[PDB]
């Protein structure tokens, strides 16, 4: 029974859409946890959509910022009801979406709401995500989403930065842990905060620290094939930050790491797996061949 008619869509004039959103939540709520697993997330996304609609008519409405506050309170309420329906991966994703939207909109006190949505996602990550793969996917989504937010002051940016690094370094498997820390290096470079007047933080030394820790994890893998894989990956990440004019990356670091791959690389047994990894290294080398303005 597709009660999920609600392809009403259409409507114009924000306030009427807000009231119909409340009516939809109210009607769907008597369906029990069985129905609200599917019916409610669409209303959460409709709330975010409606908040953006309120931002487009900023001049015509003098009360739109308070309207956005109430809209995000509505979204928070619906996501929390999803939480109470014993749901874990979905609510966290919804919270990340809400933090993204709240960061882009820009209404009064939106930074506090974006932070609160982020904290909620983290709260679900720490306690309700036990599985290895699910922890990896949840955390990597968190690093990715949080990397695009520019609505944060240093006050709020630092806790989420260090918390993301810490949470990524305590993953179950060691390869997963190294990958996550390497991905977390991006927060310490491409992150943006309110106090840099729009500038990227460009924390070169802060970037290196993350990459250094990634190598240390790769040695403890004790598994030739996977141990090797990481090395081509960490070097590649090093290339990204080098090619983005980061002075913190040196050519000596590149030479030592590249040598360390070259030394133990041949010592694996011939297979398709090692085949693709050799080609991966060869593609890295070839890309580095292109117009060298960087010694070796």
């Amino acid at each position: 029974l597709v009660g999920r008619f609600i392809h009403l869509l259409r409507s114009d004039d924000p306030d009427q859409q807000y009231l119909i959103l409340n009516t939809a939540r109210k009607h769907f709520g008597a369906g029990g946890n069985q129905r609200i697993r599917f019916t409610l997330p669409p209303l959460v996304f409709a709330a975010y959509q409606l908040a953006f609609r309120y931002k487009e008519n900023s001049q015509m409405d003098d009360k739109w910022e308070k309207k956005c506050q109430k809209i995000f309170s509505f979204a928070h309420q619906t996501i929390s009801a999803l939480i109470k329906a014993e749901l874990a991966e979905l609510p966290l994703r919804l919270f990340l979406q809400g933090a993204l939207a709240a960061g882009e909109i820009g209404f009064e006190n939106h930074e506090t709401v974006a932070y609160e949505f982020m904290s909620q996602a983290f709260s679900l990550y720490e306690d309700e995500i036990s599985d290895s793969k699910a922890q990896l996917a949840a955390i990597t989504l968190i690093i990715g989403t949080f990397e695009r937010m520019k609505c944060f002051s240093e006050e709020n940016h630092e806790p989420l930065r260090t918390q993301c690094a810490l949470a990524a370094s305590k993953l179950l498997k060691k390869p997963d842990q190294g990958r996550a820390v390497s991905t977390c290096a991006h927060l310490f470079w491409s992150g943006r905060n309110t106090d840099k007047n729009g500038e990227e933080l460009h924390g070169g030394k802060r970037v290196m620290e993350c990459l250094k820790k990634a190598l240390k994890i790769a040695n403890q893998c004790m598994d030739p094939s996977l141990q090797v894989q990481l090395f081509i990956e960490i070097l590649n990440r090093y290339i990204y930050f080098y090619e983005k004019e980061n002075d913190a990356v040196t050519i000596q670091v590149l030479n030592q790491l590249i040598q360390k791959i070259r030394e133990d690389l041949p010592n694996l047994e011939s297979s398709e797996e090692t085949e693709q990894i050799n080609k991966h290294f060869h593609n890295t080398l070839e890309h580095l061949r292109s117009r060298r303005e960087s010694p070796e």
């Binding site: 999920r4 975010y48 959509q49 953006f52 990397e147 491409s190 590649n236 290339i239």
Partner: protein, 182 residues
Amino acid sequence: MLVLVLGDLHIPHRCNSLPAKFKKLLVPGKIQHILCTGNLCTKESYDYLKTLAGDVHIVRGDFDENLNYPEQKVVTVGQFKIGLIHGHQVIPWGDMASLALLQRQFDVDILISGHTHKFEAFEHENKFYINPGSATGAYNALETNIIPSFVLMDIQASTVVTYVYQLIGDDVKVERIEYKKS
């Protein structure tokens, strides 16, 4: 012999159906390959995809209520090795340098990614990169102005021409790009 590249349907999370015109132009039989990047969420969209062609290929999206769709895939069509991934795993989300990094990891001639909701097709370092965008023009937090768009490409030999369909207003505009395996 031509492939249909689409994704980010987001039904029923953000959209109730595909655009009426898009439902019309998409007719079965004429396409024998399907590459899906986005989180089409519900299984209904998968069954609908199965009507459009026999060779349907999907990758896991961040919002897929999935039953073990793959996170990433590599498929060959005679010529060209194509990579299929939803893109949220590529950090920064829309950075091309990270996409080229992943290209080197895949060692593929064409890299298909999504989750940006912005169609983009270009050539970097003698390699090709496609991003069909949202076929339903679904909401995205990073962009207010989303253009419903999908991409179909036909491979005649060592040359592919990618035709990108976008629905601007009510008229269907199409852009054409072609790539030669270097």
